[PDB]
Every structure is written in C-alpha cells, then in structure tokens.
Amino acid sequence: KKAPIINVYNHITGKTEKMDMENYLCGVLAGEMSSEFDIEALKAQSVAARTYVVYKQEHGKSSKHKNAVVCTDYKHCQEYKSYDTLKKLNGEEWIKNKYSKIQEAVRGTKGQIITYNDKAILPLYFSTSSGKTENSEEVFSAKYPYLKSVESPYDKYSPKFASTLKISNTDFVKSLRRAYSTIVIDVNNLSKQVSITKRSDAGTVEKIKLGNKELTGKDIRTVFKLNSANFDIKFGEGYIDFVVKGYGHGVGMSQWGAEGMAEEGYKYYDILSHYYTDTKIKDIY
Ligand SMILES: [Cl-]
Ligand code: NA
Ligand code: NA
Ligand SMILES: [Zn+2]
C-alpha cells in the first residue's frame, strides 16, 4: 500500500492538519535528534517515531486531540519542527545539506515499525540514561514486555550524562512550599528531614521523603527543572546540591545510546532490538 496521510494537532494554533507520514516524521527527527547524529541512530529514531503514530492509530483516542492521531507537543506525543520553521531558523543551505540527511533516514526506513508479537509497540524514547534504561513500571504505571531495563554503556559519553544544580536552603523550602501547601519542612534541618525512600536499580527515584511529604522523583524533577528523576541530594551549609544522572524518563530507547551504538558499528535493527526487548521490525508498506 501507500504511506498514510495523518491528522496532526498543532498544540500552539489549536488547528488539526493533514500530513504525509514522511513529512511528519522528518519534522519529528528534526525536533528530537540533530542532523549530526549518525545515520543509524537517525534511522532507529525514525522507526520509533513511525511506530508511535501506528500505535496511536490502533489505540484509544486522547482527550487532548480526539480528532488527531498525534500532536506537536513533546510533553504529550513527540517533538515536531515544521519545514518553514526549520528553513527560517537554519537557512536554505542547512535544508539542502543537513535536513537532507534527516529526509534520507526517514525515507530509508519507509514503512518500518517495531513490533512485539506482530503488533506496533509503544516506542518510548529519551535522551540519555544513567547507564541502564528503566523498566516502564518503575517510571510509569504499566509493565510492557518490550520496555525492560537494559545496559546502555555508551550513554556515559553524552553531554547530558551528569549534571549538578545548587539551590540555597531558602529557595529549596520556598519552592516546595509553593508547590505543596501542606508541607512541613525546616530550612535549618534539611539533611534530617529529606531522604530517598524508594528508587529503582537503574536509579529513578520513585519515592522521596521531604519533611511530612512523600513525592516522586518526577515531582522533584518538575519543581527544580532537573534533567531527570534519577538524582541524589548533597546537604551543604546553607544549600543543597542535586546531583543528577541522565536526561529524560529513561524508558525504552536512549538517543545518545543509539548514537554510541552506531559509532561502534551497530545498525539500526540491532539498536532497536537492544532497547526494545524481544521485538522485530515490520515493513507495513
Ligand atoms: Cl537527542
Ligand atoms: Na517499507
Ligand atoms: Na533543566
Ligand atoms: Zn499528543
């Protein structure tokens, strides 16, 4: 068959528009992964992005956009940069010499999706892991046979592998009180009141105690704008330091891991079968 025409919801304008699968996917790669990544990582990424649309088509419509299979909000579906936007911000030379690589990666995987028992998977992906990916159930609510923790030994080379953020004790309590009106916490005794309660083997903080409150690592990531929910806290004199590992949710495919694998000679099928446990590739058209 031919490549489908899909409905894409523009989260800024509120208008839904028809797009050829290929054009949509090029916009997703431009937004998710740079044209500087290896072609095999870009191919892996294109298959994941295509699979996401197919999965969405085969499952329940969302309330955010019931009349569109996907939207342009990276917080809900996946990133998307339009051609006009890319041309205006990067220029014609970038379109002809760099965006062409993105176009070739997408065309190069025409109609290919990742499958588990012959059905499109939920192909979660993120920037950089802590060295191991996360099982879906330690981050999200459900377990999926293809979203299992795997080693990701090349993520250590990512510029987002490690990060640190210093916050004054005063700003730390002020920020928490603003987000949680019931919190009882003392600016002068933070090291005695704040402690990690539950975390996965990969490292995502599931439960953290802050005075009388229990929050998730994701809650903390959100309040303090951290790169991930995998962190540790150092208590200083008058301040705390968040020491953060990786970037993103940690489930499914690591983008920097795919890049590292590509550099080592792995091809996109092997990258995909590594991150998505017991999966195959299917050409639907
Ligand atoms: Cl990236
Ligand atoms: Na194909
Ligand atoms: Na940030
Ligand atoms: Zn969406």
UniProtKB/TrEMBL annotation:
<dbReference type="GO" id="GO:0046872">
    <property type="term" value="F:metal ion binding"/>
</dbReference>
<feature type="binding site">
    <location>
        <position position="71"/>
    </location>
    <ligand>
        <name>Zn(2+)</name>
    </ligand>
</feature>
<dbReference type="GO" id="GO:0030288">
    <property type="term" value="C:outer membrane-bounded periplasmic space"/>
</dbReference>
<keyword id="KW-0479">Metal-binding</keyword>
<protein>
    <submittedName>
        <fullName>Stage II sporulation protein D</fullName>
    </submittedName>
</protein>
<feature type="binding site">
    <location>
        <position position="65"/>
    </location>
    <ligand>
        <name>Zn(2+)</name>
    </ligand>
</feature>
<feature type="binding site">
    <location>
        <position position="77"/>
    </location>
    <ligand>
        <name>Zn(2+)</name>
    </ligand>
</feature>
<keyword id="KW-0862">Zinc</keyword>
<dbReference type="GO" id="GO:0030435">
    <property type="term" value="P:sporulation resulting in formation of a cellular spore"/>
</dbReference>
<feature type="domain" description="Sporulation stage II protein D amidase enhancer LytB N-terminal">
    <location>
        <begin position="11"/>
        <end position="116"/>
    </location>
</feature>
<feature type="binding site">
    <location>
        <position position="76"/>
    </location>
    <ligand>
        <name>Zn(2+)</name>
    </ligand>
</feature>
